[PDB]
Design a protein around this ligand. Structure first.
Ligand SMILES: Nc1ncnc2c1ncn2[C@@H]1O[C@H](COP(=O)(O)OP(=O)(O)O)[C@@H](O)[C@H]1O
Ligand SMILES: Nc1ncnc2c1ncn2[C@@H]1O[C@H](COP(=O)(O)OP(=O)(O)O)[C@@H](O)[C@H]1O
Ligand SMILES: Nc1ncnc2c1ncn2[C@@H]1O[C@H](COP(=O)(O)OP(=O)(O)O)[C@@H](O)[C@H]1O
Ligand SMILES: Nc1ncnc2c1ncn2[C@@H]1O[C@H](COP(=O)(O)OP(=O)(O)O)[C@@H](O)[C@H]1O
Ligand SMILES: [Mg+2]
Ligand SMILES: [Mg+2]
Ligand SMILES: [Mg+2]
Ligand SMILES: [Mg+2]
Lengths: 529, 523, 525, 318
């Protein structure tokens, strides 16, 4: 009697390296513990006082950021329930662009409180019922917590004040500069129609100087050089070709069949005369700049130099398309001269040297266009990548405001008001659902708690102050990070605001992820290949 | 390599260490959480010696399992502590300590300092002690019925519950006989003088406590009697053989008659020892050392029955039972050292073995509990349960105060602490109230192991305990309903529950103070 | 799980897993031992790791010899070992009833009934079954015929029928010889000696003693007719002094005197024996046999042979008592004052050589209260099998004497107790009626297996038997030759009341505890 | 044994062994799948060797995803797979009833009854049960309400109740739309497209089609109101000749003429499409969408965009 044998049935028929977990203890509680560990890995990065992390992935690439979704991507999350919470966070990133850390924090909190409720004696079904009804109540409530609205997205000061909050959590020290830049870019590329595309905001990261030397450019920048002798143009007449800058050849095998010394003597001169004719037709359309998506031939380059045309070679097709959008041109698959409509224009096209890097700039002078570039300067590539992520946050906030212009107070004010109202709803709801409603409410407290802990103050006093002020009636009051002691202030009057849609989607996705993790009861992992 | 500490020295620190300790402790708790109450289920543990332990006893389980986490080590140690001190509550203590650490995890995650939590816990422990002593009730230890109910309320949670009356009477008789006073010092030594001998076979219903002792021994010579109805008994620590001297007593023979004279001198020495014994006219002689065949001859000539090599513990029990005094020099033997008081010496065959009974004693201050049953494992569990029963009887006879069971005491104390917390205005009110609600785990676990609805029942019970004279209300671990303990009869010893609460709170305090684990370093 | 988070190399079977493990092992043991049951059972051969052969039909021997490493199997082996140590019979039935209780309880536990409720029903059924057992037990004057029927019922299960007809009379006569009225039977007073030369049906009862040794002096007689037996525990070889002595001499003559003197001490005891011999046997008409629990050196052997004494040395501490009960003397540890009253008498003493071994027979005692069963057989495994069988038979007759009652066999008591339990079921409160039903269907495994081993249909045979017992009320069982019901009390098929009671008690207890196990755990690492 | 004397490395289970093995495996599968049954069943999570997650309550999916290597389990997995291929439902119940038949038969076989006799009883009971099933079946006019009750009874077992209340109407309307009276229902005519952006209750029924691809020319419109749809399986990209051809020229001018000529074959089909478009849409009022099962090269895409046609390429044969 010195060995316990596998029980007859599934335990014996299970494969060698496979695992099977069943029940509250082996499955539910272990999943909740994993999600809790995940939320703890990302909690200290939440908010303006949130700290950065230096993640090294399996490829030894370095990420310095406090962006939750980035940290999650670069982590090797292997527990399946944590993977599910990460999927929720990435869905938040896809739908909204900001709020991934809210999703993580809130999901982890809901799951911890769900474990506590299961221990006190509620069933996963009742916990899920209460969580769903409380998420419905939160969605019913949030529209009433909306405090302000944008009222204009063509301005540059209002848009900066609106994007500052989203670009403050990331890059707290320097946020007025970044909000100015991102507002300039967003309103440059904002068309008279209410549709806004975030891929039309381009970001060029050039080593050298620092974040305060960054700038916006109404146009495009390419870390390229020019193929020919011309480097500058002041009234660009750009002609864009998706084809190479070479003589067209057959898609079927072509052979030069010579049968006479005369044909042999004349073939090459005929080729160059053909090239000269092609490029001269292009130059005579007025084009002073040619942009080819393919290669450039030496003879064609020769004749472009002869006829004073700036030649640019863009390897990428997305780059070619975006340049076409920028200049108002059409990519021609043939080397035929462009018509007056197929041509593009720029107030200037020139080659410059930003730092060590050489760049070709298609710059409009007008304060508008279809594409704008943000040239990010910085002393470190990692710093510039973090600032690019902050730019992405600001741009996605602008898009969220184009979709829904409503705003809720930040710094935990909406979360505290939600917690209060949902607690008041659970106190009226009879039956075992009230426990889960009240825990769903208490989960919101995790947001101001995380903000306070990262601010460097006592979260319990901060939360007590917030509850007291929201009981006295102020729904726009949240915590003040610019205070060494626990403090609170008017989030609206301070200008710290979140997006109604951001909160909506974050709450929905976090609740759905928690509820799925709870709905799991048995786990049958396979042998890790 | 230029290290400062040796490799293999790994140092963890901080909230990871705190949460790790708390999780290890609460894991030890989840191991035996279901072994508490009357409706518990057995666990079959496999020893490294090919043995088996089928039990419900928290300390048995935790002592048979092995761990490497130092927090789990500490929890197993406190289970051992509870078992050695009171001999009951070995799983109540584990569960309470786990719940206390669980509720402290909250405050530790919320930036509260472990010393603040610990000071609150100590306040709460003092107030728990106060509340238990206020709600306790006295006992008339002369009331055998009250004592039997006390012992039943302690063994109902164990396998012997089917033979409750038998086991209760056995434990009560054993402890009441082991109760001994000499020179103004009362002594209930149920470890040296209440002996459990497990003889597999037979039936448990024939198990009994003897008015005497029993050993696994036979007569040295089959001509000796095996049945004597008023034996005068002599006990010896010395060999009735002829052994050598402590010095280099080497002899030197040159004469012929000297060899024979020396061997005859040895024989005469044995004769003189045996005559020093016969002069007291005993019927039985019991030795811890050997008895030579010539000594057997002389004793048989005197019509004496001898038992050769008994253990010192068995001899001490025979002393206490028959009223004898162990001697080591038959020359120094006195009538006061002879054992009168045994009413019958019998040596009977139980199965294919010979067992010596010295029963029918009058005023025996020692006893042997003869356990019979299906197997060594069943009898090991019966013996452990009887240890529980006897230790509870002892704790009561020492401190006759009782407290109500079924979680009634836990709920009364939790309510009293919550009521006292409303005057608390500092930051310790929260951990204080938290340990108060952490005492509720005992009725929670009872309801869980009975198979009823914890939420509903615990809510009704917490509400009942807000009324005035409801500190006796608890739950049945057998039906899943709230009852008055005054009507059910489950009353625990105040000493047991005090030791439980104290051990739990101090274990929590220790693991909270702990941080910064270090390891590897070799003594 | 929880235990595996603290001890990673820990093995654990949970609430569903532990019950499955335990019940599976119990049914496996039951499947192996089902064939042992009854006289129509089959003999298993068991080969040690050395190559030694055991032929057995005995449940306990089979258990301990099978090659098994299961915890539940260990539990059941120990309960069976207790059954064997206390009663001598019931090990196969013990294992079978344990397995069947576990199976019949799993029948209801798989449909979600709680094992606690099954065990409550087990307790109710145990109570009613013990009552019915005391009711049906037959209190009978234990005559030689009844004891023969009992010993036959055991030996016919353990060995072949003709050898059983021999061992029956052997065992019954041995017990009826060493038994004193109203005095517990000391089976130690029946020696069991094995001889490996003749057929197995030569196994006999010597109304005396057979020592597995003989005289070591060749001039000593090999046969003595009217013998005085001296049972002694006195060294007759050279004894050195306890305290270190040593001899010191200055001349070879002094050395010679010391050599003659160093033996005077044992020579004196030899002379005491020789003088007693001369005083009790003034001539060579009678004989004198010394049987020493201790040694006898060659000088003493020569001295006793010269006087015509047959001296055996290094006898057994049990043979001291056996010889004083067979012959009738007094066993001595000293020759201080030895008298003819210290001697026993044997109407014949002789020696038997078998290859390299010698045997000494002490027979024709007057009324020996100690005897020996001489197990003769052609093979070591035959001798071992007969030893096991005679153990069973001796225990059976001893138990029939102790319990002046005797219970009918052939599954009769089990059939009747099942019917009584099923008639009692409604008086049981709640779903413990299902535990009662499980107990009854478990009791029914003995007649079922008896039929299965005689080569009959279990259901058909059991229906016939139950029908006959319900129509007539007579205690009927399985007829292993026709498959029909038969009155066991009328045909002489008897079981031990003690054995049945021990079965009920221990099987119920171990099955209850196994059903209530909810976690098997190896975590001692 | 016999087989092991000829093939020493052979594994064999005999009549009591064989039955125990098979029944044990069947009951093990039954014990796993017991929890899938009904709307109150529990969802299992299944993690591949790569780390992919599956949330399922479906018996067939659970069977195929569990990590099992048992012969009886393979037999029962295949019978369940047939159940799923032919009926779509009944896999969990299939496994459960198999396990319970085996267990209830072992109940009598352990007491020495022969499995042949048990199977004879099985045949009798199958006959009577099929009779009783035809008797109790409710022949009903299949109205939208009845079909909704049916689809609810299935979807409520497979997913959450609110999502089931959505999928019920979706499924019932889809089937009631692609079904022609007294014409077997071709479920191929209900496409199933997954989008990974919104909530699970946004799952809807598009009374049309959703292709998982779009136009590859940027100047092509992104929205067309009154559209003529041209479903084609005609290559609109450059096709080389079956027989090896090759081009031979003596001058860059001849090379240019051959470059212009090599595409005339596909240009002609592009012109045919464009002429049809012009004849059916004399203006930009209506729209024209080409959906090609085959490719469309960039030259053809430009030619169609210039005329205002939205061309999708490499559609599905279904
Ligand atoms: N100046 C500020 N004062 C207080 N809270 C702020 C401030 N700026 C941002 N926050 C809060 O930080 C939170 C978002 O921080 P972040 O780390 O970006 O999380 P997420 O990834 O969820 O957007 C929001 O609750 C927001 O209100
Ligand atoms: N019949 C009963 N009903 C309810 N609770 C009981 C009953 N009998 C004992 N208890 C409680 O069970 C606990 C003792 O359980 P037990 O398994 O002996 O654990 P331990 O003795 O190790 O604390 C005590 O709280 C006791 O009051
Ligand atoms: N001649 C017989 N006819 C019918 N039954 C018998 C006969 N002899 C013995 N039996 C029964 O067979 C059963 C099993 O015998 P055996 O296996 O030796 O006993 P155990 O189970 O004690 O080892 C006993 O209950 C006995 O009553
Ligand atoms: N609302 C309901 N109430 C009661 N039974 C239901 C309900 N819905 C479905 N069932 C039954 O539950 C059984 C199992 O469902 P499911 O596991 O999905 O089927 P299958 O066994 O075909 O996989 C079916 O027989 C079905 O009739
Ligand atoms: Mg943010
Ligand atoms: Mg106890
Ligand atoms: Mg027998
Ligand atoms: Mg279905």
């Amino acid at each position: 009697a010195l060995h316990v044998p596998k029980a007859p049935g599934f335990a014996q028929m299970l494969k060698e390296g496979a695992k099977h977990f069943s029940g509250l203890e082996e499955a539910v509680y272990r999943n909740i513990q994993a999600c809790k560990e995940l939320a703890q890995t990302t909690r200290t990065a939440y908010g303006p006082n949130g700290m950065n992390k230096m993640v090294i992935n399996h490829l030894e690439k370095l990420f310095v950021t406090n962006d939750a979704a980035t940290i999650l991507r670069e982590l090797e999350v292997q527990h399946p329930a944590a993977k599910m919470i990460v999927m929720a966070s990435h869905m938040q990133e896809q739908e909204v662009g900001d709020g991934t850390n809210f999703v993580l924090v809130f999901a982890g909190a809901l799951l911890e409180l769900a474990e506590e409720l299961l221990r006190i004696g509620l069933s996963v079904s009742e916990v899920i019922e209460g969580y769903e009804i409380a998420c419905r109540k939160a969605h019913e409530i949030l529209p009433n917590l909306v405090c302000c609205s944008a009222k204009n997205l063509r301005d540059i000061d209002e848009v900066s004040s609106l994007l500052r909050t989203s670009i403050m959590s990331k890059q707290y020290g320097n946020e007025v500069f970044l909000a100015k830049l991102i507002a300039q870019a967003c309103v440059s590329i904002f068309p008279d129609s209410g549709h806004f595309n975030v891929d039309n905001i381009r970001v060029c990261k050039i080593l050298g100087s620092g974040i305060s030397s960054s700038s916006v450019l109404h146009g495009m920048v390419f870390k390229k050089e020019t193929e020919g002798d011309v480097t500058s143009v002041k009234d660009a007449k750009i002609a864009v070709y998706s084809c190479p800058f070479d003589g067209m050849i057959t898609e079927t095998k072509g052979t030069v069949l010579i049968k006479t010394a005369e044909e042999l003597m004349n073939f090459s001169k005929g080729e160059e005369n053909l090239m000269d004719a092609q490029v001269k037709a292009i130059a005579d359309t007025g084009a002073n700049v040619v942009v080819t998506g393919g290669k450039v031939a030496d003879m064609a380059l020769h004749y472009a130099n002869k006829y004073n045309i700036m030649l640019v070679r863009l390897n990428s097709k997305w780059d070619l398309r975006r340049l076409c959008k920028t200049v108002g041109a059409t990519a021609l698959p043939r080397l035929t001269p462009p018509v007056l409509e197929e041509m593009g224009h720029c107030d200037s096209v020139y080659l410059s040297e930003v730092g060590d890097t050489q760049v070709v700039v298609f710059k409009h002078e007008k304060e508008d266009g279809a594409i704008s570039t943000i040239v990010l300067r910085g002393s470190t590539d990692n710093l510039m990548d973090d600032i690019e992520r902050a730019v992405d946050d600001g741009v996605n906030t602008f898009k969220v405001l184009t979709r829904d212009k409503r705003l809720v107070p930040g710094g935990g004010a909406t979360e505290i008001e939600l917690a209060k109202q949902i607690t008041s709803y659970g106190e009226t709801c009879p039956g075992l659902e009230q426990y889960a409603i009240k825990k769903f409410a208490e989960a919101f407290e995790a947001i101001p708690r995380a903000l306070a802990e990262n601010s460097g103050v006592k979260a319990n006093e901060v939360i007590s102050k917030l509850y007291a002020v929201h009981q006295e009636g102020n729904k726009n009051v949240g915590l003040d990070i610019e205070a060494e002691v626990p403090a609170v202030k008017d989030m609206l009057e301070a200008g710290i605001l979140d997006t109604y849609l951001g909160k909506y989607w974050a709450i929905k996705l976090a609740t759905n992820a928690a509820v799925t993790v709870l709905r799991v009861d048995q786990i049958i992992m396979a042998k890790p290949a | 390599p230029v290290l400062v500490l040796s490799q293999n020295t790994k140092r963890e620190s901080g909230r990871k260490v705190q949460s790790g300790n708390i999780n290890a402790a609460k894991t030890i708790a989840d191991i035996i959480r279901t072994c508490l109450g009357p409706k518990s289920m057995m666990k079959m543990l496999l020893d490294p010696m090919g043995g088996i332990v089928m039990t419900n006893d928290g300390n048995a389980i935790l002592r048979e399992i092995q761990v490497q986490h130092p927090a789990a080590k500490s929890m197993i140690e406190i289970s051992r502590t509870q078992d050695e001190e009171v001999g009951d509550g070995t799983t109540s203590v584990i569960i309470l300590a786990g719940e206390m650490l669980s509720v402290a995890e909250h405050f530790l995650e919320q930036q509260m300092h472990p010393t603040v939590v610990i000071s609150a816990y100590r306040k709460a422990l003092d107030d728990m002690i106060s509340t238990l002593k206020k709600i306790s009730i006295p006992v008339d230890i002369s009331d055998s019925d009250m004592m039997l109910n006390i012992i039943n309320s302690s063994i109902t949670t164990k396998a012997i519950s089917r033979w409750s009356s038998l086991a209760c009477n056995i434990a009560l008789d054993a402890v009441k006989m082991v109760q001994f006073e000499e020179n103004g010092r009362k002594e209930i030594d149920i470890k040296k003088y209440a002996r459990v001998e497990k003889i597999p076979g037979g039936i448990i219903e024939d198990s009994c406590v003897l008015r005497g002792v029993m050993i696994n021994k036979d007569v040295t010579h089959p001509r000796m009697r095996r049945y004597i109805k008023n034996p005068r008994i002599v006990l010896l620590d010395s060999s009735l053989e002829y052994k050598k001297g402590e010095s280099q007593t080497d002899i030197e023979i040159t004469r012929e008659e000297d060899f024979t004279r020396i061997l005859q001198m040895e024989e005469e020495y044995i004769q003189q020892l045996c005559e020093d014994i016969i002069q007291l006219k005993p019927d039985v002689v019991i030795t811890e050392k050997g008895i030579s065949d010539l000594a057997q001859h002389y004793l048989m000539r005197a019509n004496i029955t001898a038992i050769r090599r008994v253990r010192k513990t068995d001899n001490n029990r025979i002393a206490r039972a028959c009223g004898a005094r162990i001697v080591s020099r038959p020359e120094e033997l006195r009538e006061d050292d002879v054992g009168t008081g045994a009413g019958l010496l019998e040596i009977k065959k139980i199965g294919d073995e010979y067992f010596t009974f010295i029963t029918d004693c009058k005023d025996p201050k020692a006893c042997t509990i003869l356990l019979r049953g299906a197997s060594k494992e069943i009898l090991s569990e019966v013996e452990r349960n009887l240890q529980d029963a006897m230790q509870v009887c002892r704790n009561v006879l020492l401190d006759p105060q009782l407290v109500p069971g079924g979680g009634a005491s836990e709920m009364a104390v939790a309510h009293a602490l919550t009521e006292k917390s409303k005057a608390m205005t500092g930051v310790e009110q929260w951990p204080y109230r938290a340990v108060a609600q952490a005492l509720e785990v005992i009725p929670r676990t009872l309801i869980q192991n009975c198979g009823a609805s914890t939420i509903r029942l615990l809510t009704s019970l917490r509400a009942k305990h807000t009324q005035e004279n409801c500190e006796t209300w608890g739950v049945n671990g057998e039906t899943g309903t709230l009852v008055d303990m005054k009507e059910l009869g489950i009353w625990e010893p105040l000493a047991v529950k005090l030791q439980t609460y104290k051990t739990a709170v101090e274990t929590a305090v220790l693991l909270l103070r702990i941080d910064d684990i270090v390891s590897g370093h070799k003594k | 799980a929880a235990v595996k988070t603290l001890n990673p190399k820990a093995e654990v079977a949970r609430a569903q897993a532990a019950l499955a493990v335990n019940i599976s092992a119990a049914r496996g043991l039951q499947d192996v031992l089902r064939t042992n049951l009854g006289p129509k059972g089959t003999m298993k051969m068991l080969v040690s790791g050395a190559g030694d052969i055991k032929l057995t039909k005995d449940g306990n021997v089979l258990l301990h010899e099978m090659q098994i490493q299961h915890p539940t199997a260990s539990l059941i082996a120990k309960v069976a070992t207790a059954q064997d140590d206390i009663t001598g019979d019931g090990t196969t039935s013990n294992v079978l009833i344990i397995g069947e209780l576990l199976k019949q309880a799993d029948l209801y536990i798989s449909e979600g009934l709680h094992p606690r409720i099954i065990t409550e029903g087990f307790e109710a059924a145990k109570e009613k079954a013990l009552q019915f057992l005391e009711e049906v037990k037959v209190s009978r004057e234990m005559d030689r015929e009844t004891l023969i029927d009992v010993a036959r019922t055991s030996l016919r299960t353990k060995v072949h029928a003709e050898l059983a007809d021999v061992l029956t009379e052997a065992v019954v006569d041995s017990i009826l010889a060493i038994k004193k009225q109203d005095e517990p039977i000391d089976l130690f007073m029946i020696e069991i000696m094995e001889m490996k030369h003749k057929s197995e049906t030569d196994t006999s009862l010597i109304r005396g003693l057979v020592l597995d040794h003989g005289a070591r002096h060749p001039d000593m007689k090999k046969r003595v007719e009217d013998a005085y037996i001296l049972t002694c525990n006195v060294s007759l070889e050279y004894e050195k002094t306890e305290v270190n002595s040593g001899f010191f001499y200055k001349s070879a003559e002094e050395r010679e005197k010391l050599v003659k003197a160093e033996r005077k001490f044992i020579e004196d005891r030899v002379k005491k024996i020789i003088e007693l011999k001369r005083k009790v046997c003034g001539d060579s008409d009678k004989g004198f046999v010394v049987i020493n629990q201790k040694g006898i050196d060659p000088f003493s052997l020569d001295a006793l042979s010269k006087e015509g004494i047959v001296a055996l040395r290094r006898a057994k501490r049990r043979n001291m008592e056996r010889l004083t009960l067979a012959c009738g003397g007094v066993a001595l540890n000293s020759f201080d004052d030895l008298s003819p009253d210290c001697l026993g008498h044997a109407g014949l003493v002789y020696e038997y050589t078998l290859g390299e071994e010698k045997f000494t027979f002490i027979e024709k005692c007057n009324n020996p209260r100690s005897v020996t069963l001489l197990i003769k057989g052609p093979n070591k495994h035959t001798l071992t099998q007969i030893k096991d069988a005679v153990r069973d038979g001796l225990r059976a007759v001893k138990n029939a004497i102790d319990d002046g009652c005797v219970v009918p066999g052939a599954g009769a008591v089990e059939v009747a107790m099942a019917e009584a339990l099923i008639k009692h079921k409604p008086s049981v409160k709640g779903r413990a009626q299902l535990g009662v039903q499980a107990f009854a269907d478990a009791l029914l495994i003995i007649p079922k297996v008896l039929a299965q081993n005689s080569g009959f249909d279990l259901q058909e045979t059991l229906v016939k038997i139950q029908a006959e017992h319900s129509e007539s009320g007579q205690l009927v069982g399985v007829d292993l030759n026709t498959g029909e019901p038969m009155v066991a009390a009328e045909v002489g098929v008897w079981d031990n009341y003690c054995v049945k009671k021990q079965l009920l008690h221990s099987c119920t207890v171990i099955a209850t505890n196994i059903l209530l196990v909810d976690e098997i755990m190896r975590a001692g690492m």
